[PDB]
């Protein structure tokens, strides 16, 4: 269902929803099993671009999230039209030795040719096995 | 209910210092950027400096660049301004204005500004 | 950074429409917006995404940005509607702001 995230931008992203996940419950993210998540946004800009830009940190500590796919245009239609809705399915696999944790912030910022695309921030991701 | 006061404007020699504030109230300060954008006596606006609702992200014009930098207390919910080694055409009256976001975005506008506080260099 | 260019100054005769320009290179590609700055007073938004005008706001006031130009649209104006106009648009992360066109009524 629809879950909660904190907008780091101005308010582009409409919804965000995670399959069996909801609201500011814990999200539970496992290990070694494709993760997916998908956002309704509105377009600010025209842009032939997007870029993710993922910062997480586990207890704390900042940590590299691996094998994510920075060109959002591959999951949603590009080019955007400044004004329109979009929607994008994002799928991520969670590597076997992605280490386990009950705390996880985890900003994403996508970028376009003439500025900040969308931000959020999530923090009720837990990975577990 | 919103509100943005401004404090810290003066009279300063060329290469002088100043701090200014901006003390916020009547919304969540931390959810939300606040710029300045200032304005010469008799001129248009221009823009000076912003900080996302974290202070995450400082943005500065090359103007202004290298000189100034910009700052939050978000526990006081005060937005400061440090401005050293200032020149004369760096006189004018600051405004902070708080933008519709935590991040400045194409769609971003500026939908609160305090009364301003004026600095003035001069030799 | 990039530069808007509005008309300096604009006068109107009281119910006369005015028409303030502001146009850059891409502008079409982002939002602008618009501010009223009346004489010894701060700032106020008026048109806030290309064509949307704040509650508050009254209903006179339009805005569009076709063909790399954004253009404010002030019908019936009046004495009240008399100051300074700033068209604004983001360089990225730097906030723009135009040149200022002063709209005066000849009443």
């Known amino acids: 269902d629809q879950v909660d995230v904190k907008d780091c931008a101005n308010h582009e992203i409409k919804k965000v929803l995670v399959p069996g996940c909801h609201g500011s419950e814990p999200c539970i993210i496992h290990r070694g099993k494709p993760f997916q998540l998908e956002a309704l946004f509105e377009a600010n800009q025209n842009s032939k671009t997007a870029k993710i830009e993922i910062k997480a940190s586990i207890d704390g500590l900042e940590v590299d999230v691996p094998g994510i796919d920075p060109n959002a245009c591959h999951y949603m239609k590009c080019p955007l039209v400044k004004g329109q809705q979009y929607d994008i399915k994002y799928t991520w696999n969670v590597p076997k030795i992605a280490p386990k944790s009950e705390n996880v912030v985890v900003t994403v910022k996508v970028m376009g040719d003439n500025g900040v695309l969308a931000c959020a921030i999530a923090t009720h991701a837990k990975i577990r096995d | 209910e919103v509100q943005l006061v401004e404090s810290g404007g003066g009279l300063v020699q060329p290469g002088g210092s100043l701090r200014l504030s901006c003390a916020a109230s009547?919304?969540?300060?931390?959810?939300?950027?606040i710029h300045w954008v200032r304005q010469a006596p008799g001129k248009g606006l221009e823009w000076v400096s912003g900080?996302?609702?974290?202070?995450?992200?400082?943005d500065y014009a090359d103007s202004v660049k290298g000189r100034l930098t910009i700052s939050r207390d978000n526990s006081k919910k005060t937005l400061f301004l440090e401005m050293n080694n200032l020149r004369p055409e760096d006189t004018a009256i600051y405004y902070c204005?708080?933008?519709?976001?935590?991040?400045?975005?194409?769609?971003?506008?500026?939908?609160?500004w305090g009364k301003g506080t004026t600095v003035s260099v001069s030799s | 950074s990039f530069e808007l260019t509005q008309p300096p100054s604009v006068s109107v005769s009281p119910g006369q429409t005015a028409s303030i320009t502001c146009s850059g290179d891409?502008?079409?590609?982002?939002?602008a917006s618009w501010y009223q700055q009346k004489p010894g007073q701060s700032p106020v938004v008026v048109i806030f995404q290309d064509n949307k005008r704040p509650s508050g706001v009254p209903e006179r006031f339009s805005g569009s940005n076709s063909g790399n130009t954004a253009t404010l649209t002030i019908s019936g104006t009046q004495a009240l509607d008399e100051a300074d106009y700033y068209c604004q648009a983001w360089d990225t992360s730097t906030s723009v702001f135009g040149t200022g066109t002063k709209v005066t009524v000849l009443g």
């Open positions: 900080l996302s609702g974290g202070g995450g992200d400082t």
């Open positions: 204005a708080k933008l519709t976001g935590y991040g400045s975005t194409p769609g971003s506008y500026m939908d609160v």
């Open positions: 891409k502008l079409g590609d982002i939002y």
């Open positions: 009547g919304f969540t300060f931390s959810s939300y950027a």
